[PDB]
């Protein structure tokens, strides 16, 4: 209860155990303050170094480049409940060590009593379901296209059409926050007018994740406006906003916090470097975000299905025993009726946000038919019937399977 | 004046020009909003892919893995003066593209009129010189060791000794911000008592970079305390604080903002991925930081001397014509008398912060002798005389060269 643990994959032509203790020392005090190495397991060595290293080559250190999984134990008293310094401690300068040709933070384990000193999701799954009025199926979302460039009026008109098509959730693209084309203030006011009127007429709430990413003081002003205009959700580019900004924003907004992880590829595409999702999502969940992106099965991005599955499962796993702090996973990229089965089987529940672009909007019979094809796919998998069997009963679905 | 430019190195088994336009489209609107590809130059292909990619392997796309340097042009109207969304635009999801097995943002070029809409350094070089009263030589700094674990009283006693040894600048390690061992409030009060008394007696100001890294609201409280206690500088772990937090902090503190870049190795160690320093430091300078770290020549970290030299030169280069917004480069890692010549030759001036740990503290004749050895090295290079010649006149320097 007085420590946390961090697991790494390291690579070095030197002795892995010595290097692990260099890591432990450098990230702490070099009894109350020294981190320790709890586990070392040597893996198959690499024939070539994963990363350049000037210190090692200055000395012509010979291969092979040994690999090991290690666990470090850190005294909590070194950090207290300081989120960005927690990151400086478990990640920080470790990546730069002259001893290593690879270092990746794989996972974190925090005591519940420590986790409690940060922020919990205000809404998470249950709150998002309450706000979208969606009970026993996933929430279906889409993204405003073009990503940026529409006027506020054009965005509002489009949002109206997307609502009428039957989605539960709509988000700004991450490159659209406060563009001159459709400044945040004008965009929120115009869009919410349509969303409110749509709710009135249809009885269906639609959650719009307005991208309020900005300077922190500005973000708070944006979030206040979204709330005043009857919104339920704000989106932020977490990596560029930072833990410091997001934790502060979390304390002052009662809205759903939809975390967009753009930039995470820089932190993770190289398996020998950076941060695996388990660790990444642990740190981000301490800021109190309600949703996290996991990309998608059979997606158009670089991520493997295995990574997407594990990342989704991370979202549903409480950070510590009895915390009840799961977040809603958002699947995206090439999602459509044909990725529903794999998605359902990955999550093992319907507690997910399913983002579909062309899978809805490019349906041959229109966006409404597109939404229906996705809803029909979900009905099928929840009932346990294969999609191509259910399609015999369901024209929108059948047409989608044939077209895509 | 209505655009900015971003240069990348990309790797793909597909057509580089097509991929470049995919990048341009995805990061904009897929006349007023569409980014364009201004330059493509194909380089030598790679025999193996730099990064795994599930989309490409799902399709058994054959090699080779082509490489190209590209330049994108982005319309400013898409972004306006929004720092974290600027990052989402020029970096963001580009790293995840299914088309690529490598993507690195190399550099950025912004118009002066756009740069002006962000934050300038409050102090930069001139202000730091004024606050340390150091005019015609570099400022010499050291780091409080152990990194974390000392009590507030122990830290203050140590800081007193470091002042007496003759340094100009002292910083907390990045893993020490608000530890239970020496909470920020107690540490600032105890340390500044010693620093103020040292100034009184010696006539020498010493700048202490207190690590205030924390939740944004807390950071502002910490910065207010540092100012009230007569401090001149606060340090922040920029990557974990985020652009949103730092830009806001910049507007409310009149202190020197010492940016610690821990975590940047994750963003840069793999040459096929992430962000080169030119681009990184451009984005960070828009938040108004006063100092940036460049690591060190002959250092103990992984970075090459070439990278350190270029990064230092970046710091001194104004972001745009006539901006006069240079920041102070901080050199560190294995720095001592013997790295002074290379450092001077890299910077081509004395406008730098020279951080020395063991190079000062482990001098055989004591820390004061250590500081003197470094000051003597600087005197030598500024006068144009080789260190081993000057050492014949200068015992502290001679002893350092023999010992280290």
Tab-separated table of N, CA and C in Angstrom, chain A residues 40-90:
chain	number	residue	atom	x	y	z
A	40	UNK	N	13.114	-9.639	-12.626
A	40	UNK	CA	13.816	-9.575	-13.894
A	40	UNK	C	13.613	-10.911	-14.584
A	41	UNK	N	13.271	-10.875	-15.864
A	41	UNK	CA	13.182	-12.101	-16.651
A	41	UNK	C	13.844	-11.857	-17.988
A	42	UNK	N	14.950	-12.543	-18.255
A	42	UNK	CA	15.623	-12.356	-19.533
A	42	UNK	C	14.877	-13.071	-20.657
A	43	UNK	N	14.755	-12.386	-21.792
A	43	UNK	CA	14.054	-12.890	-22.957
A	43	UNK	C	15.079	-13.197	-24.038
A	44	UNK	N	14.605	-13.583	-25.216
A	44	UNK	CA	15.497	-13.800	-26.347
A	44	UNK	C	16.167	-12.484	-26.749
A	45	UNK	N	17.481	-12.521	-26.946
A	45	UNK	CA	18.225	-11.324	-27.308
A	45	UNK	C	17.928	-10.903	-28.737
A	46	UNK	N	18.179	-9.632	-29.031
A	46	UNK	CA	18.053	-9.124	-30.391
A	46	UNK	C	19.414	-9.173	-31.080
A	47	UNK	N	19.412	-9.453	-32.380
A	47	UNK	CA	20.651	-9.532	-33.152
A	47	UNK	C	21.172	-8.151	-33.524
A	48	UNK	N	20.273	-7.169	-33.526
A	48	UNK	CA	20.629	-5.784	-33.808
A	48	UNK	C	19.929	-4.881	-32.799
A	49	UNK	N	20.545	-3.736	-32.474
A	49	UNK	CA	19.947	-2.806	-31.502
A	49	UNK	C	18.695	-2.131	-32.064
A	50	UNK	N	17.651	-2.025	-31.247
A	50	UNK	CA	16.392	-1.441	-31.700
A	50	UNK	C	16.493	0.072	-31.897
A	51	UNK	N	17.325	0.722	-31.088
A	51	UNK	CA	17.491	2.173	-31.140
A	51	UNK	C	18.963	2.566	-31.225
A	52	UNK	N	19.260	3.650	-31.956
A	52	UNK	CA	20.614	4.214	-31.912
A	52	UNK	C	20.975	4.647	-30.499
A	53	UNK	N	22.265	4.647	-30.197
A	53	UNK	CA	22.724	5.081	-28.895
A	53	UNK	C	24.171	5.536	-28.983
A	54	UNK	N	24.394	6.840	-28.831
A	54	UNK	CA	25.721	7.424	-29.024
A	54	UNK	C	26.718	7.036	-27.934
A	55	UNK	N	26.238	6.883	-26.705
A	55	UNK	CA	27.107	6.509	-25.600
A	55	UNK	C	27.637	5.093	-25.804
A	56	UNK	N	26.756	4.177	-26.185
A	56	UNK	CA	27.173	2.796	-26.392
A	56	UNK	C	28.123	2.663	-27.577
A	57	UNK	N	27.885	3.418	-28.643
A	57	UNK	CA	28.767	3.281	-29.794
A	57	UNK	C	30.097	4.005	-29.602
A	58	UNK	N	30.094	5.076	-28.814
A	58	UNK	CA	31.341	5.740	-28.441
A	58	UNK	C	32.295	4.734	-27.809
A	59	UNK	N	31.744	3.624	-27.333
A	59	UNK	CA	32.540	2.634	-26.621
A	59	UNK	C	32.576	1.279	-27.306
A	60	UNK	N	32.028	1.214	-28.514
A	60	UNK	CA	32.021	-0.020	-29.275
A	60	UNK	C	31.579	-1.222	-28.462
A	61	UNK	N	30.590	-1.025	-27.596
A	61	UNK	CA	30.036	-2.135	-26.832
A	61	UNK	C	29.481	-3.174	-27.802
A	62	UNK	N	29.929	-4.431	-27.673
A	62	UNK	CA	29.494	-5.479	-28.599
A	62	UNK	C	28.101	-5.999	-28.264
A	63	UNK	N	27.419	-6.546	-29.264
A	63	UNK	CA	26.160	-7.228	-29.034
A	63	UNK	C	26.436	-8.545	-28.335
A	64	UNK	N	25.407	-9.390	-28.190
A	64	UNK	CA	24.038	-9.164	-28.664
A	64	UNK	C	23.317	-8.140	-27.793
A	65	UNK	N	22.120	-7.751	-28.209
A	65	UNK	CA	21.339	-6.785	-27.446
A	65	UNK	C	20.284	-7.500	-26.625
A	66	UNK	N	20.627	-7.726	-25.365
A	66	UNK	CA	19.815	-8.526	-24.481
A	66	UNK	C	18.487	-7.846	-24.173
A	67	UNK	N	17.461	-8.652	-23.952
A	67	UNK	CA	16.140	-8.133	-23.641
A	67	UNK	C	15.638	-8.725	-22.339
A	68	UNK	N	14.917	-7.923	-21.567
A	68	UNK	CA	14.343	-8.415	-20.328
A	68	UNK	C	13.066	-7.682	-19.963
A	69	UNK	N	12.144	-8.403	-19.331
A	69	UNK	CA	10.990	-7.785	-18.693
A	69	UNK	C	11.362	-7.549	-17.243
A	70	UNK	N	11.123	-6.340	-16.748
A	70	UNK	CA	11.474	-6.031	-15.370
A	70	UNK	C	10.301	-5.381	-14.655
A	71	UNK	N	10.291	-5.489	-13.332
A	71	UNK	CA	9.308	-4.782	-12.528
A	71	UNK	C	10.045	-3.921	-11.526
A	72	UNK	N	9.698	-2.634	-11.481
A	72	UNK	CA	10.217	-1.728	-10.464
A	72	UNK	C	9.149	-1.421	-9.422
A	73	UNK	N	9.586	-1.255	-8.177
A	73	UNK	CA	8.709	-0.842	-7.089
A	73	UNK	C	9.111	0.555	-6.635
A	74	UNK	N	8.158	1.486	-6.653
A	74	UNK	CA	8.410	2.883	-6.299
A	74	UNK	C	7.697	3.260	-5.009
A	75	UNK	N	8.407	3.910	-4.072
A	75	UNK	CA	7.737	4.394	-2.860
A	75	UNK	C	6.823	5.582	-3.156
A	76	UNK	N	5.558	5.472	-2.767
A	76	UNK	CA	4.584	6.526	-3.037
A	76	UNK	C	4.961	7.853	-2.395
A	77	UNK	N	5.653	7.791	-1.264
A	77	UNK	CA	6.055	9.011	-0.574
A	77	UNK	C	6.955	9.906	-1.444
A	78	UNK	N	7.631	9.317	-2.427
A	78	UNK	CA	8.453	10.104	-3.349
A	78	UNK	C	7.608	11.013	-4.236
A	79	UNK	N	6.354	10.618	-4.467
A	79	UNK	CA	5.532	11.248	-5.502
A	79	UNK	C	4.343	12.004	-4.918
A	80	UNK	N	3.727	11.418	-3.897
A	80	UNK	CA	2.397	11.831	-3.473
A	80	UNK	C	1.417	11.859	-4.656
A	81	UNK	N	0.294	12.563	-4.521
A	81	UNK	CA	-0.779	12.453	-5.521
A	81	UNK	C	-0.608	13.451	-6.655
A	82	UNK	N	0.563	13.410	-7.265
A	82	UNK	CA	0.978	14.367	-8.277
A	82	UNK	C	1.071	13.637	-9.617
A	83	UNK	N	0.045	13.810	-10.449
A	83	UNK	CA	-0.080	13.040	-11.686
A	83	UNK	C	1.060	13.281	-12.680
A	84	UNK	N	1.355	14.548	-13.019
A	84	UNK	CA	2.463	14.709	-13.976
A	84	UNK	C	3.836	14.285	-13.427
A	85	UNK	N	4.070	14.410	-12.127
A	85	UNK	CA	5.328	13.907	-11.582
A	85	UNK	C	5.351	12.381	-11.484
A	86	UNK	N	4.182	11.766	-11.317
A	86	UNK	CA	4.092	10.314	-11.439
A	86	UNK	C	4.591	9.901	-12.827
A	87	UNK	N	4.131	10.598	-13.862
A	87	UNK	CA	4.612	10.303	-15.215
A	87	UNK	C	6.118	10.554	-15.366
A	88	UNK	N	6.628	11.624	-14.762
A	88	UNK	CA	8.056	11.930	-14.832
A	88	UNK	C	8.870	10.828	-14.170
A	89	UNK	N	8.243	10.134	-13.224
A	89	UNK	CA	8.933	9.124	-12.426
A	89	UNK	C	8.957	7.772	-13.131
A	90	UNK	N	7.796	7.304	-13.585
A	90	UNK	CA	7.717	5.984	-14.221
A	90	UNK	C	8.045	5.995	-15.702
